[PDB]
Amino acid sequence: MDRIIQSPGKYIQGADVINRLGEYLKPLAERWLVVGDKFVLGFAQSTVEKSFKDAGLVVEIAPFGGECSQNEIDRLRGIAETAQCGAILGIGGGKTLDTAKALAHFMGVPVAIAPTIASTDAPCSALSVIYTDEGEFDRYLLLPNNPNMVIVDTKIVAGAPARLLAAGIGDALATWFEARACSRSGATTMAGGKCTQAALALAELCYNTLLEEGEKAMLAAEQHVVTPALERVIEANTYLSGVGFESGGLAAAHAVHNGLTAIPDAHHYYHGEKVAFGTLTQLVLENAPVEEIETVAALSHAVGLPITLAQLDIKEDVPAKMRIVAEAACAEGETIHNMPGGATPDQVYAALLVADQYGQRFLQEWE
Amino acid sequence: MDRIIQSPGKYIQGADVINRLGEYLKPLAERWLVVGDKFVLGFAQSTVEKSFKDAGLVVEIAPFGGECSQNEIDRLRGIAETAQCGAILGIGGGKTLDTAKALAHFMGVPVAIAPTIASTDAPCSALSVIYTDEGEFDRYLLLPNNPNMVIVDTKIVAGAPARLLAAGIGDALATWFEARACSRSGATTMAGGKCTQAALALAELCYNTLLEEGEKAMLAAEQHVVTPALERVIEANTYLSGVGFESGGLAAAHAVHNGLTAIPDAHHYYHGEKVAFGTLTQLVLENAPVEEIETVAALSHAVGLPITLAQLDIKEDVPAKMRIVAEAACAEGETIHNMPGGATPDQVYAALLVADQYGQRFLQEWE
Amino acid sequence: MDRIIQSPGKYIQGADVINRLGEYLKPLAERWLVVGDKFVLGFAQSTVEKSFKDAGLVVEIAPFGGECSQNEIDRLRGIAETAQCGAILGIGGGKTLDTAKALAHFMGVPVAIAPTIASTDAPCSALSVIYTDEGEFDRYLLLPNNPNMVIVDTKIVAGAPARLLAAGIGDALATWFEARACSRSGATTMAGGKCTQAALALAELCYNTLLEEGEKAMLAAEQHVVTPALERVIEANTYLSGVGFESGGLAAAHAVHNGLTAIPDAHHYYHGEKVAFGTLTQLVLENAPVEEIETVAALSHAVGLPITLAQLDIKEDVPAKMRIVAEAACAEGETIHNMPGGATPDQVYAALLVADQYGQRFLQEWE
Amino acid sequence: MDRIIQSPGKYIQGADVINRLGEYLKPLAERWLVVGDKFVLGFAQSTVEKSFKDAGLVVEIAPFGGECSQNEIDRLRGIAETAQCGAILGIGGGKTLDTAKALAHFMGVPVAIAPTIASTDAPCSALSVIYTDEGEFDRYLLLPNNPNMVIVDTKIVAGAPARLLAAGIGDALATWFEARACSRSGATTMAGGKCTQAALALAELCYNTLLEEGEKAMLAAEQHVVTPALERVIEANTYLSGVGFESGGLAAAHAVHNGLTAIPDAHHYYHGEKVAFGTLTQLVLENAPVEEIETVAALSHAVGLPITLAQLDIKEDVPAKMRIVAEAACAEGETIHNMPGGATPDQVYAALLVADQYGQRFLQEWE
Numbered sequence A, B, C, D: 001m002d003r004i005i006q007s008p009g010k011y012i013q014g015a016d017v018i019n020r021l022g023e024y025l026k027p028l029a030e031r032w033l034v035v036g037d038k039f040v041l042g043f044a045q046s047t048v049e050k051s052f053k054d055a056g057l058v059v060e061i062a063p064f065g066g067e068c069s070q071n072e073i074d075r076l077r078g079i080a081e082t083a084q085c086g087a088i089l090g091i092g093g094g095k096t097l098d099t100a101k102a103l104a105h106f107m108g109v110p111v112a113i114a115p116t117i118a119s120t121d122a123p124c125s126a127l128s129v130i131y132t133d134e135g136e137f138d139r140y141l142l143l144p145n146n147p148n149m150v151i152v153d154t155k156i157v158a159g160a161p162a163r164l165l166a167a168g169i170g171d172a173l174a175t176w177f178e179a180r181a182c183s184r185s186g187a188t189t190m191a192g193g194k195c196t197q198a199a200l201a202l203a204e205l206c207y208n209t210l211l212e213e214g215e216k217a218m219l220a221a222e223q224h225v226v227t228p229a230l231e232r233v234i235e236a237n238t239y240l241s242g243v244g245f246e247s248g249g250l251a252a253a254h255a256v257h258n259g260l261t262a263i264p265d266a267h268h269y270y271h272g273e274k275v276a277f278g279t280l281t282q283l284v285l286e287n288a289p290v291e292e293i294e295t296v297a298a299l300s301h302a303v304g305l306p307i308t309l310a311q312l313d314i315k316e317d318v319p320a321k322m323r324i325v326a327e328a329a330c331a332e333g334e335t336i337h338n339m340p341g342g343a344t345p346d347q348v349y350a351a352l353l354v355a356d357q358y359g360q361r362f363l364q365e366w367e
C-alpha cells in the first residue's frame, strides 16, 4: 500500500542553544506558555525567561506536575486559556514533552519541544502516552502533527545524570531491530503505511551510531561535558530513533517493555532500561546470530543497561512473572504481532527466560 | 554552531494515491483551493474532486498560469481571498508547486504538495523560485516552513514522459556530492546550520539508490508502469534529494547549473539536465577519483543525461560561453563558495572545459 | 505452525541403470505393470523386460496414450485390474510419470518413476497434473505420497534432445527464487507447512549447481554423452528442484508460467521454457539486484531459454496479451500470492513488460 | 557407480504437534499399536490416547521394555497380531524407535516415528540396531524402507534433560566429517551407492547449524523451552544427520564409537557422547587443521560432551584399553576402512592417544 514518513518540521541541536531559544521560536508565535520540568526550572528558569525577553516574546512558565495525565493536561489547559498564548513550549523529560504535545493539540496551537535529556524517542513523535495520576498507563493519544520544532541543548543534556543518557541508548538501540522486523513482515507503521527507505536508513544509522559512539558518549556524559561523540548519540537517541520507530515500526522489544511494566519489581525502572531487555528478548525470538546478540549485550552492559532479569529487580517468582510479561506482550493490538510469523505467549516466555540466561552467562564470562 | 534538519511534516507515496487525497488532506482544512497545471488538471479534475467530496471537503480549482511570478501569485491571491479557503493544494510540476508554496505563505495557511512528476527536488523544500512573467529569474522566496504534506502518486508519475524522470535523476544525483562537499567545508546549509548525520545519510542513500535502481526505473518509466525500482527512484528524487539538498547543502554543481542558464543555447533543457553536467564539473573541480567520475558519467549517460557541452546544444564559441558560465557560477552569494578551499572563475572555467573533454572521451569509448 | 519436508523414499541415478531396474524394483512387488511412452518403449522394451525377468519378476507393458487424462487412467485402471499387479512403473516424460502416479493412487499400490528426460521437476513430486484428452488443463490431483522410487538413467537422458535438458534447467532455475520468496513471506508449501532448513538448502544448491554446471552439461547434452557435469544437472533438475519446489514453495514464476499457457502463441514451448521467463518476471516483481537478474538472464540465454516475449512467439498485441497473463497469474489460489506483500494484476503486468524490456536490452548488448 | 539418496516419506516438526498426531497418522491406517517409552508414557499416555480418539483412530499402547532386542520385538509381534493393527507408532528414544521400525518390518505395515528426544540420528534411518537383553550389540537389521512418517514435538524434546540434546549434538557433529571422508574416498554408503550432492549439502548444513545454533539451543534446552535455535538443532540432529549419514557415509568417528563401547568404563555413556570423542579421534586421523579441531573441541566442550578419555571414565590402564578400542574399530567390515587411504590399528591407537592429549590441553587452557 502507501509508504509514509513523518517528521517534525525543524530539528535543532547545539551547545547552549537555550540562549537562542527565543530567536528560534519567534516565527511560531508571540505569546508562549512553557511547561517545564521542576528540576530543570530549578537551575534554568531565569535563563529561559531571559531567552524569551531578548527576542521580544511574552512567556508564562508553568512548572510540571511530573506525570502526563489527563488531570495535569486539563490543569494546564485552563492556565493556557488565561494566558491567551499562541503556542506551547515543553522543556524537560519525555513526560514533560508528551504533556506539552497533548496540551497544544487540545489548544489548537503549534508546539516546540526542548528535551533536557536524551532519555527516550518521545521528542519527535506525533504521540502522547497518557497515564493515570498513579503512574499506570491510561491511553495513547495519537496526534495529527509532529512537533513544529525540536530544540536540543547538548550542554544541558550533558549536565544530567549519566544514567538518563544510557536509558536513551536503551530505547534507541531497539529502533533498528524493530523497524527491520516490520519491513521483513510488511507491518504497518504508526505513520499509517509501509516503510520507506529513508526511515530504514535512519533506523540502521541509529544502530551503527550507538555501536560506534555509545561508550565514548557515556564518558562525556559522566564528566558532564560535550564531545562530538555525545552530539551524535543525542541525535541518534532523538531524531534518528524517533523517525526510525514512528515511520519504521515497532515489534517485540517494546511489547516486552509493556509486559515488564506490569511486574511491580521493574515498574519504576526507566523506559529505555526496560526496552533494553526487550531488545535482547527479541534477538532470541528472531534467532539473531551469536555475534549480533553479543554485540548488543556488550554495548548494553558497557553503558549500564540491564541485561538480566535480576538487574530489573526480578529475582523471585521469575517463571510466574515472566508468564505475566509474555501474556501482556501478546495482547490484542500489541506490536509483537509485527514479528515475522508472529509470536505466541509460549514463544515470548521462552525468549524471556533464554535472554535472561544469556545475560547471566555474559556477566560471568566478564568477571 | 547549531546543526539543523528540516522536513515536510508528512511524505506519502503510493500508486493511485490521488484517490485518497481527501482522506489524507482532511486533518489540515475543510475548505481547499487547488492550484493546478492545465495539462494535469485536464486528466484528473474529476478524480481530484470526487476524492475531496467523498471525504466531505469543499474544493475550488484554479488553473495555473504556467510561470512562477508575483503577478501569478497575486491573481491566485485574489481567488483565494474570494474562495475563503483553509489551505492550498498544488498539483503539477515544480512551477505549480513553488507557486502553491508561495500562495500559502502570503495567505498564511497550510499547503499540500502533490507532484505529478519526479523531475526536481522542489516538492519538499522550504523555498520557491520566482520568475518574471517571461521566464527569467526574479528572486528567491525563502519560506519559513516546508510543506505540511507531500503526496506523490507513482502511477501518475509513471504516465509522465520518461525524459522527466531522467531529469529528476540528474537533479538527485548531485545531492550526495554537494552535501558531502559542504560537510568537508563546514559550510552552512539553507536550514541555517551545520550538517546533521541524518541529512548526510539521506543524501548518500540518494546516490546509492540512483546507482542501484536508476536504470531499472527508466525501463518502467519508458513502459509507463510502476515497479518497486521506479518506486524507489521517485523517493530518491523527491524526499531524499529534497531533504539532502536543503539540510545537507549545495555546492558547485548547482552554481554551474545557474551559470548555464545564462547561455541561451541551453535554455531548452530541463533543470536536472543542466545539473547533470554541473555534477561532472564539480567532480573535476574537487578532483574526484577516476572511478567516481566514471560511475557518475556512466549512470548519467545510461539514463539519457548530458555529459558534454554539445549535448546541452553548446557547440560554438565554447571558451567565450564557458567564461560567462564560470563568472556567473562564482557570483557573490553563489553556492560554489561552499567548496573546500573555494573556487575562482579560472578554476571553474578549467573544470568546465576538462569535464566536457571527459564526457567526450567517455562517449567515444562507449562505441 | 509445523515445518514439513516430503521426499521419495529412494532416488537412484546412474548410467545404464535401466539394466538394474528389476534388482532395484524387487523389494516393492513381484508383479509389475509398466506405463510407458511409445517412443521410449520402442527403444528399451527388450532392455526393460530382460531386467525384470533376470530379477524374477512378472511384467506387463501398457503403452501410454500421450496425455494425462482420467479417461487415460481409467483405460489403464482396467488393464491393471486385469494385470493383477502389485506396483506401477512409469517410464517416460512428465506426462507418463504423472499418469503412473495417478494410476498407482487409485489402485493403491506403490509406484516407481523412471524419468527418461530431465525436463521438469515432476518425477519426485506428490502431485499429478490432469488434462482433458485434448491438452487443456483439467484438475490438480494432490497425492498422499511421493513415489516410492525414482530411477534416472543418465545415459538415456543424454540421448534425449538437448532442448529438453535446457527445459529442465529453466524449470529448476526457478526453484531457489520461489522457495526463497516463500520463506521471506512465511507462506505454506504444498507439503502443508512452513519451510524447513533442508528444503531451502536443497533449493539453493539447485541454483548454484545450475550456475556452476549448466553450460558444461549442455555441451555433453549436445554430444549425447555423460559427464559428471551432466550428472549433477540431472540431479538438480530432478531431486533438488522436486523437493525444493514441493517443500520450499512456489511463487510468481510459476503463476506467470500458468498465465502464459492462456496465450495460444506460447503453446508450442515446453514447460520449463515458459517458467524461464516467469523467473525473470519474478525477479523484476521483487526488484532483485541488477547482478542477480543479469546472472539469471545470462544463464538462461547461455543454454537457449527464452528471455523475451518474442522468444515465446509473442510478438503482436503484447499489452493485451500481458493483461490476460497477469489476470490469470493473479487468480484466486495462485502461488503469486505467496510473494512478500502480495501482487496485484497491475504489478504483474508491469513486471511482464519490464522483464521483456530487460531481455531485449540483454540480447542487444550480447552482440 | 550408481548414486542413491534415501529419505523418510514425510518429516514433521513443530511445537505441541503431539496433539495433531492423530490427524497426521490417519492417512496411513485406522488401527494403531504404539510402542512407547515408559518415562514418556508416564506424562503423555493420556495425551497420545486423546490424539488418536479425536481423529477417529483405534489405538493400543504397549509400554516399551527398554532394549531393542529380538525378545522385545518378538513380544510386541504377538501383541500386534492380537491387536490386528495396520501400523506401528514408535514414541520415545532411539531404542524405542528402532524397536518400532523392526516391529513394523516383521509385521509388514507402515511405521510412524515420534522422537521424544533429539539424541541420535536413528529416527529417519532405514536401520534397526538389535541388542541382546544384556545390552550387548547383536546385529544390524537393514530395512527396505525408511519410516513413512517422522513427527517431532519440539516442546516434548525441550522438556527432556539437556544432556540428551547434547548427546544428539555429539552424534550429528560427526555427520559432515564422516560423509566428507567417504566422498573423498569413493566409499559406498548404506543407501547402496555413491554420495549425491544433496546428501553432502545436508551433511555440511548439519555441521554449520550446530556451529551456529548449538550453544543457543542448549540454553533453551536447559530452560526446557522452545526457541528457533532449538528448532534448528532438532532438525540438524534428526533429519539432516540421518540423511547425512545414511546417504552420505560413515567413517572413523563411528568405528571408534563401537570400540569405545567395548571398554566397560565407557559402555553406559550415551551413543552420541561416545561418538563425540570418535570425531576428535578422526580429526587427528585425517590431520584436520588446528582451527578445525579447536572449533569442534570448543563446541563439544561448550555443550558438555566428552573431549578427553577420562571424561568417559577411562582413567586407568589407558594404553591397554585404547589398544582394545583400536582393534575393534579396525575389524573387518568396520566403517574406518572408508577413511582415505584406510587406517591400521596402529594409526587409530595413535589417534586415540593424541586426541585425548589434545582434549587435556584444551581443558587446561580453559581453566
Ligand SMILES: NC(=O)c1ccc[n+]([C@@H]2O[C@H](COP(=O)([O-])OP(=O)(O)OC[C@H]3O[C@@H](n4cnc5c(N)ncnc54)[C@H](O)[C@@H]3O)[C@@H](O)[C@H]2O)c1
Binding pocket: A037, A038, A039, A040, A066, A068, A092, A093, A094, A095, A096, A098, A116, A117, A119, A120, A121, A122, A125, A126, A127, A128, A129, A156, A157, A159, A160, A161, A164, A270, A271
Ligand atoms: N510519545 C512517544 O513517542 C514516547 C516515546 C517514548 C517514551 N514516551 C514517554 O516518555 C516518558 C518517559 O520519559 P523520561 O524517561 O524522560 O521521564 P521523565 O520525563 O519523568 O524524566 C526523567 C527524570 O529526569 C529528570 N530530568 C529531566 N531533565 C533533567 C536534567 N536536565 N537534569 C537532571 N534531571 C533531569 C526529571 O526530573 C525526571 O525525574 C513516559 O511517559 C513514556 O511513556 C513517549
Ligand SMILES: NC(=O)c1ccc[n+]([C@@H]2O[C@H](COP(=O)([O-])OP(=O)(O)OC[C@H]3O[C@@H](n4cnc5c(N)ncnc54)[C@H](O)[C@@H]3O)[C@@H](O)[C@H]2O)c1
Binding pocket: B037, B039, B040, B068, B092, B093, B094, B095, B096, B098, B116, B117, B119, B120, B121, B122, B125, B126, B127, B128, B129, B156, B157, B159, B160, B161, B164, B270, B271
Ligand atoms: N524550490 C526548490 O527548491 C526548487 C528545486 C528545484 C527546482 N525548482 C524549480 O522547479 C521548476 C522546474 O520544474 P519542472 O522541471 O518540473 O518543470 P515544470 O513544472 O514546467 O513541469 C514540466 C512539464 O511537465 C508537465 N507535466 C507535469 N506532470 C505531468 C504528467 N503527469 N504527465 C505529463 N506531463 C506532466 C507539465 O505540464 C510541464 O509542461 C523551476 O522553476 C525550478 O527553479 C525549485
Ligand SMILES: NC(=O)c1ccc[n+]([C@@H]2O[C@H](COP(=O)([O-])OP(=O)(O)OC[C@H]3O[C@@H](n4cnc5c(N)ncnc54)[C@H](O)[C@@H]3O)[C@@H](O)[C@H]2O)c1
Binding pocket: C037, C039, C040, C068, C092, C093, C094, C095, C096, C098, C116, C117, C119, C120, C121, C122, C125, C126, C127, C128, C129, C156, C157, C159, C160, C161, C164, C270, C271
Ligand atoms: N506434478 C508436478 O509436480 C509437475 C511438475 C512439472 C511438470 N509437470 C507436468 O509434466 C508435463 C510436462 O512433461 P514434459 O515436459 O517432460 O513433456 P512430455 O512428457 O510430453 O515429454 C516430452 C517429449 O519427450 C519425449 N521423450 C522422453 N524421453 C525421451 C528420450 N529418452 N529420448 C527422446 N525423446 C524422449 C517424449 O516422447 C515426449 O514426446 C506437463 O503435464 C506438466 O504439467 C508436473
Ligand SMILES: NC(=O)c1ccc[n+]([C@@H]2O[C@H](COP(=O)([O-])OP(=O)(O)OC[C@H]3O[C@@H](n4cnc5c(N)ncnc54)[C@H](O)[C@@H]3O)[C@@H](O)[C@H]2O)c1
Binding pocket: D037, D038, D039, D040, D066, D068, D092, D093, D094, D095, D096, D098, D116, D117, D119, D120, D121, D122, D125, D126, D127, D128, D129, D156, D157, D159, D160, D161, D164, D270, D271
Ligand atoms: N538405527 C540407526 O540408524 C541408529 C542410529 C543411532 C543410534 N541408534 C540406536 O539408538 C539407541 C540409543 O538411543 P537413545 O540414546 O535415545 O537411548 P534410549 O532410547 O534408551 O533413550 C535414552 C533415555 O532417554 C529417556 N527419555 C526419552 N524420551 C524422554 C523424554 N521426553 N523426557 C525424558 N527422558 C526421556 C528414556 O527413558 C531413556 O532412558 C541405541 O540402541 C543405538 O544403537 C540407531
Ligand SMILES: [Zn+2]
Binding pocket: A120, A121, A171, A254, A271, A275
Ligand atoms: Zn521507546
Ligand SMILES: [Zn+2]
Binding pocket: B120, B121, B171, B254, B271, B275
Ligand atoms: Zn536542483
Ligand SMILES: [Zn+2]
Binding pocket: C120, C121, C171, C254, C271, C275
Ligand atoms: Zn515447473
Ligand SMILES: [Zn+2]
Binding pocket: D120, D121, D171, D254, D271, D275
Ligand atoms: Zn550415530
